[PDB]
């Protein structure tokens, strides 16, 4: 039972010399809870952030395999963030703690600087998602 058919719609464009991160919704989620569902949240951070102020996070929606957030974040790090990547950590919250790895992905600021990234990203592993950046057009 490892059907990683879940997809996430993540958008990251450069505007006002800042990063416009917009998370739409997710579809085809797989149950990672005893109740037979999954309630993950959207987490994004632009390393290196030792100030802990570039770390953005939203709360989970509810019991559904197709949750929509529609959250829009806009921030940017120092000029030396071009070689850095926007790390998105998608985890399934379990009320008291976390213990379900849904998937992780990242977007390079250097690539995003010359072209905005918007599409459906597949469920990749920690290293797979932080070292790569392959979005699916789906349109």
């Amino acid at each position: 039972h490892t059907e990683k058919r879940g997809r996430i719609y993540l958008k990251a464009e450069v505007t006002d010399e800042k990063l416009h991160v917009t998370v739409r919704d997710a579809k085809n989620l797989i149950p990672m809870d005893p109740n037979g569902l999954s309630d993950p949240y959207v987490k994004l951070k632009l390393i290196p952030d030792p100030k802990n102020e570039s770390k953005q996070k939203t709360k989970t929606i509810r019991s559904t395999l197709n949750p929509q957030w529609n959250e829009s974040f806009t921030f940017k790090l120092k000029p030396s963030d071009k070689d850095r990547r926007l790390s998105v950590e998608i985890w399934d919250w379990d009320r008291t703690t976390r213990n379900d790895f849904m998937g992780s992905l990242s977007f390079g600021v250097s690539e995003l600087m010359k072209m905005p990234a918007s599409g459906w990203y597949k469920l990749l592993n920690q290293e797979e998602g932080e070292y790569y950046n392959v979005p699916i057009p789906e349109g």
Partner: peptide, 10 residues
């Protein structure tokens, strides 16, 4: 860095 990963609901 604090407990942000496990900081949502009680």
């Amino acid at each position: 860095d604090q407990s942000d990963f496990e900081g949502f609901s009680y």
